[PDB]
Write a protein that binds this ligand. Structure first.
Ligand SMILES: [Mg+2]
Lengths: 138, 199, 175, 190, 109
RNA sequence: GGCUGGGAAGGCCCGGCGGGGAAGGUGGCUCGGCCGAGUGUUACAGCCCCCCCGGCAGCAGCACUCGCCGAAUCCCGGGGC
RNA sequence: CUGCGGGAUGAACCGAACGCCGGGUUAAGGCGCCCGAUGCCGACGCUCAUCAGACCCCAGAAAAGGUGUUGGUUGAUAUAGA
RNA sequence: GAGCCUCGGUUGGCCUCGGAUAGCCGGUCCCCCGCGGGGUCCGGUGCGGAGUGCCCUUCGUCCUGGGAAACGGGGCGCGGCCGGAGAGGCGGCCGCCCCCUCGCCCGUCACGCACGCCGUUCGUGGGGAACCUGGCGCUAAACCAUUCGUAGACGACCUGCU
């Protein structure tokens, strides 16, 4: 029932470490819990990276298991991994987290007012729909 | 301001240490569903350990000897007490803040209960290892009210299913109502998603 | 002797010149040590074990770290061991898969300590040689010699168990 | 060590239709339906190909002990398919020297009573697992037939009625008496 | 019109296993669980507020039953967000596991 | 600042030499709609990798943080007690 | 004839020796709770005990065995088919 | 309304079952069962946005003067229908009177502006004891003494007496 595999050319997201929050592609497998990784288009050099700190997405580009850092970059550019990643819900949620982190007190006040109006409007509509549903049931 | 924890799927000592530490810090902690507690190792190991504990008694007068409580909630209470300075006034005051129950009593059956990932079996224990349920262990050493607790828990779960069905209906109607008036809240939604909401 | 992240040092030494022997020969060794101070001590220990040379009667001519030639390529390293057990000593051959020779030696030390309870002082490193995909005896290294190698992460036990400690949601192990 | 990948496949016939509820195999066919939950085994249960022709089991990063589960689950699935297609029939013969063993089925085949075992006045009533029906075999003077879909239950009932007839406080090598399983086959051989 | 102090808990005094130093208190600030978020709270004023039987003076108000012991955050304590604090008078040890409010106005940001 | 007057790496690559994984190829077989996917066999390179001949600014222990030792070859600023 | 930190407990052990205090840092030892500190997104392996194991002095075990499991050494045969 | 003692605090979350080599949400064209439940299929997410890395509420007041939204709220608002028994001790659903124009964006001023200085801001009409207003209901039992022996060292125990 597995849909994600450690394959040569698999794109992985680094959860934590020096290159945290940066995409990277798997080149070759070093050991059970360590693989050679390369991130030419995401400012990541070629070095070993444990599987613990990486969570791999559903992007797989094809290149030989021991390419010399040049053909992997070409495949990354041809597949346009950056745009596809930016289009995914994962990157959008990460950006939402960052926006929440960078929100200032004035922005918090604006958000408070916006929610104050929006929740009231939505709950009024919900109450009206509940009354209509009760009328329909009877 | 009171912590309510669901005991199902939590390891005995792993949860007990955290609960004792929080209790010593003035926090009020309620532990619920103590029959769901599980202990590492096969059932026979823990059965033998509890029987060996049962053998411990004062030879001259067993009434003054150790008190072997059979209920799973009282077993968890004793394990937590073993991790507190209960001989001092501070330890007794802290232990007064702790409250354990078999099953989920009506006072807490309508509350959301938290779980501690640092004490869960799925996290702390290998999938190939064996474990024993505290309810079965208690039932085989003197516990009397396993079946009554099971029946009451079944009734409570049916009531919770009814409430959860109502909550699903409410949430679905809420989502539909948001779509209905999405034009009148476009400016309010845009500013919300500008600062990292609804994305 | 302790262990850390070992580095490969090339140490060259000779006995002090004497009127009898005006030009003594030069000897070199491959020493894997945390630093050069202990690398010199290990070189002297091995030379005294082999030759009739001591630190007082000799001198260190050159001591320098040996950098990895291809740090970006994965290689198979064969290490020949000579360690002491509770009983008599034994000879071993072990294979490891690492990017650097020093990393392979560190893995060898860790594996020896884990599997045979052998400390660093009891272990003597004889020869470390890089080997191709073939000529590998250990199936653990050989099972990774596959161009189309695939394996998922079945049971991803989550970390950050103490990042916010009380949560209403139970974690997830399938990704 | 840890094996990177170990797998085995089972080729089911076209008669049998198999489905999996994650890790629970439900097998149905001509004779009936058999269920067996394969939890607590931690294997990848894959059902590949159209018409569900083949069932594949996978095990990633397993040691020596966890490796045998791959073969044992395939064996269990094979037995389940054989039972749902052909079934299991166990024939057992009663052995005695002087006192004849009197065996009578009581309800349909579930309740079996054994009488006159070594002259004992005591009568053993043995209950069998659900889904297994016992009967008195014909064309043989003293033989019993056990039939069912699940091999485990039929074999367990056969073991129960084997252990019911046991000689106590005597040389078992000399007193070779009791009912013993003589043949392990299928109801229909085809 | 609202709360302008962070919640903290008097965990105990600075101590070893068998020796206790009462001139330095250990504080458990809520929401801080690492030795990297404690830099904000360094130097912050902290007070232990309590009530007593007799009335005392009150700055800018009528006499009340409230008395306080003022303090100051000194340094972090061991990778867990614990904070060492020093008060003008040592804490009564009755406030173990009780509320201590750390102010926000030794501001330096 | 030194080192292997750092080791590798990055870019345009050019004129070659051999060897090996085993591939836009062939092919016994298998799974789906000539193609897509999975295995093996001799195996050149249009997927590549490695050594030998040689040369360009593009370097720098490099904020693409892959692993050193450091300070008349070293100075400035800020925070807390 | 000697207090102090650690070894739960304590003659001789480890560190270290004493005027009354404030600040900082260590030794030997530790950092799930008792109990100060790993609430590191620590690293690599080994181990299932129906008598598990858990730190000088020290508070307990031997010879002999085990296809239980994990590594090493030697020796043969296997497409002329084990 | 004062009047003594004792303290904790400084917005709440009113809730499925649950598995981890898997799960969450709808429609369910289809089938079965008692508006709902179960199954097949289909469609969306899954390092969880139907995320506790979360949601809910604003934490200055008042005048009038506009736009968007809008019949919402309150008078411990008064009367009926219920759910809840594990240790219920809380809420849900309907009738009638009066009052207010509360949420969001901008005009418009005025609120001891106490001239920099700390326990501000609440759950709280907090909990315990003694005294000042009214409406609705109350009338004792226990023990000693006596008596009895199913009881007994003495207490205690079983009994009787307008
Ligand atoms: Mg107050």
């Amino acid at each position: 029932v597995f849909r994600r595999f450690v394959e040569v050319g698999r794109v992985a997201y680094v959860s934590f470490g020096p290159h945290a929050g940066k995409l990277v592609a798997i080149v070759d497998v070093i050991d059970q819990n360590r693989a050679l990784v390369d991130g030419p288009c995401t400012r990541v050099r070629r070095q070993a990276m444990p599987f613990k700190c990486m969570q791999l997405t559903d992007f797989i580009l094809k290149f030989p298991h021991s390419a010399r850092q040049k053909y992997v970059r070409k495949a990354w550019e041809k597949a346009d991994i950056n745009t596809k990643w930016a289009a995914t819900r994962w990157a959008k949620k990460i950006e939402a987290r960052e926006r929440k982190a960078k929100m200032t007190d004035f922005d918090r006040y604006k958000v408070m007012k916006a929610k104050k109006m929006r929740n009231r409007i939505i709950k009024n509509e919900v109450k009206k729909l509940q009354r209509a549903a009760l009328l329909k049931a009877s | 301001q009171v912590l309510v924890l669901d005991g199902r799927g939590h390891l005995l000592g792993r949860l007990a240490a955290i609960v004792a530490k929080q209790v010593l810090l003035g926090r009020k902690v309620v532990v619920v569903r103590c029959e769901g507690i599980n202990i590492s190792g096969n059932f026979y190991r823990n059965k033998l350990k509890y029987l060996a504990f049962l053998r411990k008694r004062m030879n001259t007068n067993p009434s003054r000897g150790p008190y072997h409580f059979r209920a799973p909630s009282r077993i968890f209470w004793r394990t937590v007490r073993g991790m507190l300075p209960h001989k001092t006034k501070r330890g007794q005051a802290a232990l007064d803040r702790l409250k354990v129950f078999d099953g989920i009593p009506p006072p807490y059956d309508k509350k959301k209960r938290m779980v501690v990932p640092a004490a869960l079996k799925v996290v702390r224990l290998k999938p190939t290892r064996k474990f024993a349920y505290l309810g079965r262990l208690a039932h085989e050493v003197g516990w009397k009210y396993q079946a009554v607790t099971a029946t009451l828990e079944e009734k409570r779960k049916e009531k919770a299913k009814i409430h959860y069905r109502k909550k699903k209906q409410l949430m679905r109607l809420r989502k539909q109502a948001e779509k209905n008036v999405e034009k009148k809240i476009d400016r309010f939604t845009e500013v919300l998603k500008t600062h990292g909401f609804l994305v | 002797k302790a262990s850390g992240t070992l580095r490969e040092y090339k140490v060259v030494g000779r006995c002090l010149p004497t009127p009898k022997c005006r030009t003594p020969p030069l000897y070199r060794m491959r020493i894997f040590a945390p630093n050069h101070v202990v690398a010199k001590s290990r070189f002297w220990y091995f030379v005294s074990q082999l030759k009739k040379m001591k630190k007082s009667s000799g001198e260190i001519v050159y001591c320098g770290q040996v950098f990895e030639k291809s740090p970006l390529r994965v290689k198979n390293f064969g290490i020949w061991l000579r360690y002491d057990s509770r009983s008599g000593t034994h000879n071993m051959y072990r294979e490891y898969r690492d990017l650097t020779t020093a990393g392979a030696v560190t893995q060898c030390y860790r594996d020896m300590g884990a599997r045979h309870r052998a400390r660093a002082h009891s272990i003597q490193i004889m020869k470390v040689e890089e080997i191709a995909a073939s000529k590998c005896r250990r199936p653990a290294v050989k099972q990774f010699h596959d161009s189309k190698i695939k394996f998922p992460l079945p049971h991803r036990v989550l970390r950050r168990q103490h990042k916010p400690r009380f949560t209403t949601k139970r974690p997830n192990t399938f990704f | 060590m840890k094996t990177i990948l170990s797998n085995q496949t089972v080729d089911i016939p076209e008669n049998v239709d198999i489905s999996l509820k994650g890790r629970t195999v439900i097998v149905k066919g001509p004779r009936g339906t058999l269920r067996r939950d394969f939890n607590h085994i931690n294997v990848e249960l894959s059902l590949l190909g159209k018409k569900k022709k083949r069932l594949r089991v996978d095990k990633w990063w397993g040691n020596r002990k966890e490796l045998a589960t791959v073969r044992t689950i395939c064996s269990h699935v094979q037995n389940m398919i054989k039972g749902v297609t052909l079934g299991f029939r166990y024939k057992m013969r009663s052995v005695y020297a002087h006192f004849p063993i009197n065996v009578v089925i009581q309800e349909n085949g579930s309740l079996v009573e054994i009488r006159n075992f070594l002259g004992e006045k005591y009568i053993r009533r043995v209950r069998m697992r659900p889904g297994v029906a016992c009967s008195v075999s014909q064309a043989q003077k003293d033989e019993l037939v056990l039939e069912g879909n699940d091999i485990e239950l039929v074999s367990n009932s056969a073991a129960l009625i084997q252990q019911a007839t046991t000689v106590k406080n005597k040389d078992i090598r000399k007193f070779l008496d009791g009912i013993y399983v003589s043949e392990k086959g299928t109801v229909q051989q085809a | 019109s609202g709360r302008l102090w962070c919640k903290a808990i008097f965990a105990g005094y600075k101590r070893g296993l068998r020796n206790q130093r009462e001139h330095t208190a250990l504080l458990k600030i809520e929401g801080v669980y690492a030795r990297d978020e404690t830099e904000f709270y360094l130097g912050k004023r902290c007070a232990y507020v309590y009530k007593a039987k007799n009335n005392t003076v009150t700055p800018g108000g009528k006499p009340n039953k409230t008395r306080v012991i003022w303090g100051k955050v000194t340094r972090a304590h061991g990778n867990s967000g614990m904070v060492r604090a020093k008060f003008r008078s040592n804490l009564p040890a009755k406030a173990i596991g009780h509320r201590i409010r750390v102010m926000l106005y030794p501001s330096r940001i």
